[model samples]
Target: EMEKEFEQIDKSGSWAAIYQDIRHEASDFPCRVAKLPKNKNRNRYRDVSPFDHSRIKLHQEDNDYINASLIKMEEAQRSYILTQGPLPNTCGHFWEMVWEQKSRGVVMLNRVMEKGSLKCAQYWPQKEEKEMIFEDTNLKLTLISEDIKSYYTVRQLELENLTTQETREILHFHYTTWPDFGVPESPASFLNFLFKVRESGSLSPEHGPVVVHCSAGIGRSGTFCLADTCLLLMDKRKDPSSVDIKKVLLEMRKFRMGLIQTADQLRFSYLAVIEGAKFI
Candidate 1:
């Protein structure tokens, strides 16, 4: 069964080859990949796609049926999966998070709950008693929405230990910046937020993986995920990790068919993630 899925992901025996041909290669950061049929207003919650249950073959359909799996990228590979969504609400959008392992690595999928009642607590992984470390950075600035001042808050959420009935923290963030539809003044604010969260002891390496979500978990979520992938690559002082980026992104699309909708948004996201690491 697993072999069948691996073949599905790599029918050509070359994942990069298939991805290169399928994704739009122009727009934001030159060669950033983008989904076809671009989605305008991608930044807004007005036109979000319903949670895709068929993508993963999840037999059950409920907001609480979030899935998480550990994947080994290769014999000598290391990777992690991060996911997130809104705090569960009754908006007909059932928020979901799925982590799937592939031959390449682990990729995370976040879905908006759209099939049943929104159960907030059930979605939250159990909490452990630890001092929450808060890192303060200029990135703490606010993005105004209606009357509420919003800013990005990067923190690792807890993931349940399905095998042991325990939970561990995973690095993640929540972003809410002004001009929400387009680029922000500086990528530093968002990038710094991630560093702050990690340094503050809020997110330890012990965390299984990170999950980040916003209202739709597509725009902000995709941006955050893409940012992390880029930063990790830059830190190595090498070209971006091709295997990691492609697999996570493919997993993302498998979950949300048209996520990271626009060519420009996808490109910018790739650049921003690398740019965000400039000050680090």
Candidate 2:
């Protein structure tokens, strides 16, 4: 009689019996296996992630392809730019990249505001400090610097732009923490503020697209830009489009290095924008 019994292997005992059985039962076959290229930015800190050398190369290649595809419109200029970063490292590099692309102008949004002698200045306000008055007028650019603790920069910048009579305002956003660092209320508040500003007749075709950025220029920055762009797109069309989202993300990565960092962070765009839509 032929019989087969299965027994669990215990580490306490020698595996000789189990190994012998498996070896005998196993079939011999000719096969070859090769390792797939590992994701370069896999498991990296969210801020520095998705910004490896290969990804940068990929971005350049895609841009070249896009340029070739639009050879007739090679001279066309971009309306707005968005960046994500932590100060000192990715942010500086992102700015340099924008400058190289011959961007007409750049708007930076960060927690810390450093004008460095620039004509445009930013304001920071706390929930308690409601007395501060911000100027309202047309401004060339608004660079919201790193103000992790303050809440007023986004609103103040938009408000000032709404008041602008002659010049169109360019709004730039900056945040310090990576997408992993939780910033629940602030981002939601920012979208609400943008809607308000838009209603005020500030964001016009002449003004151009709103620029956005955060540290590493991927996680949070990506969320903001994607959410905003998708919302506008959805308004234009009655249905949601994953293609639209992918297009925005692809272009953003090509221009800079990375935009959205994590799957979780990318998900937030859907959640936050949906919430923002409710308020709208």
Candidate 3:
């Protein structure tokens, strides 16, 4: 009945009503540690906070709070660690999370500099520089290779634990064309980049969760995870028509707040699912 109602109202093309409905359904949820006095500065945006129940907290410290959450899509058997871009003080914690989670890829959806503002910190090293060290965590990331494309870049890097002398290969995926609070240029390009991540099998169930972030990590991060999760569920279904994009988004929101920031982002996500259905 809910699916049929949405088909009548939004499938007729008035998705704005559906967006409003989504906001109404997303009542306030608890973010206890996010509001802790010691953890306040860890969050990039005051309004965007991680849900306390699903936050990825470091166990070894007294206040190991990071403004990040583990998003799980049970139906698709996929998980993504979604978090904000690393602040200057939290860069080491960012890599610490990656190493601890054993993530093989880090999907960055925004540029370091965007729209005359600092969108995200340069957590990785440049090709020219070769390497960057995180003094806070005693870890270093060295660039191994770089492939520049029209809208995205794929870099192979080696993350070394300086103290332990252990190293592992990591993939950094940056989508250059996507705007900060908006969607990508097209669903085709978006899906292409997503498939690029898929081809590496970085998101495979056997591997640790893939770490995905943007500036605030809620808008574009949610869109990326939402689309990828929806597409995977569609692939699992006998008929792609049964997949409900909005429902998948709402389910994702239980782990992180304010996913699919605007009506446009929601629309873009819906379109991404439709296009990716054709792709798979």
Candidate 4:
């Protein structure tokens, strides 16, 4: 069912309308917290504000807020906290959420910089630098290990609460070759990087959503999220045809707005999943 759905969708090249179809489903919700004057600077892209209902509130304070959303994919039995690549001023809030939520891993799809601009703040510790201190939240990140490869890097880092003296070992998976304003090099290449993260076991069942940050925003972020969720659904359903890619993406957008942003991304979401299904 899914194969033919994708086949027809791809063959017809109706990605433009196909993407818009999902955009029509969800209700427009207010992003009140992100609009507050004081909390505004914490946002990376002002226009793409986090929807209030699904946005993550700081556990440390009743009044605190951050530009992040907790997108729970219950059927997949996992949750993903979709976050903007950290703003320099809000990296403290970023790490605090990780500590409070008991999240074990962070997957970074966007690089530190792209297209002559900084895409993501230096949120974690660099190997030579070894450590990063966040005075705003009394937290420090120390790089324990760094394994750099052709396309990605897996960093084992230690996050600590200075006041409480508690520490957590967080795995940081970075897929480095993603091009600016588009998808990865190839579906197979991207799937290999994605599956590599899976092999690390950092995504095992957890109460808190694993923090996922990508600088290119919804198109890039949502594409990967959709593919991952759909693959797991197929795993459980025992047939790729049984899983509806469009519906699942529509459902995911209920958790975070405006996913799979363009015809190209919509096309690639199908491409990535279709290729990965070969192994199944």
Best by TM-score: 4
Clashes per candidate, residues 3 or more apart or on different chains: 10, 26, 0, 0
Residues 39-148 of candidate 4: C-alpha lDDT, one tens digit per residue: 77787777777888898888765557887787788888867888889888989999999988888889898888889899889998777476889998899999999999
Give lDDT per model, in order.
0.37, 0.37, 0.85, 0.81
The candidate maximizing lDDT is: 3
| Cα RMSD for candidates in order | 14.1, 16.5, 2.5, 1.7
Looking at model 1, which ten-residue stretch has the lowest summed lDDT? 136-145
Extract clashing residue pairs from model 3: none
Q: Across residues 30-59, which tens digit of lDDT does each residue of candidate 1 receive?
A: 111111134221222333343333222223
Model 4 segments beyond 4 Å from truth?
A: none
Order candidates by lDDT, high to low.
3, 4, 1, 2
Q: lDDT of candidate 1?
A: 0.37
lDDT of 3 by residue, 1-280 (tens): 2345445666688777788899888746799889988887788899989888899976456567898999988988999999999988888889988888888999999889888899777888887476889997789999999999998999998999898999999999989888655566578888899999989878998788999998989888888999898888877988767778878888998999889888888877877777677666
TM-score of 2: 0.43
Runs in model 2 lying further than 4 Å from the true structure? 1-79, 84-109, 113-150, 154-180, 185-187, 196-203, 240-254
For each candidate, what TM-score against the reference?
A: 0.44, 0.43, 0.92, 0.94
lDDT of 2 by residue, 1-280 (tens): 0001111222234245533443344323211110112322211233233322222211232121100000010112223344333232222233223323333323333444333322112232333334223221122223333234333333332122224333222333333332234546435656754554455443344443444444334456556655666566555554543324445555545433435545445445545666665555
Model 3 alpha-carbon drift over 4 Å, by segment: 1-13, 128-130
Q: Alpha carbon lDDT of residue 10, candidate 3?
A: 65
Worst 10 residues of 2 by lDDT: 64-73
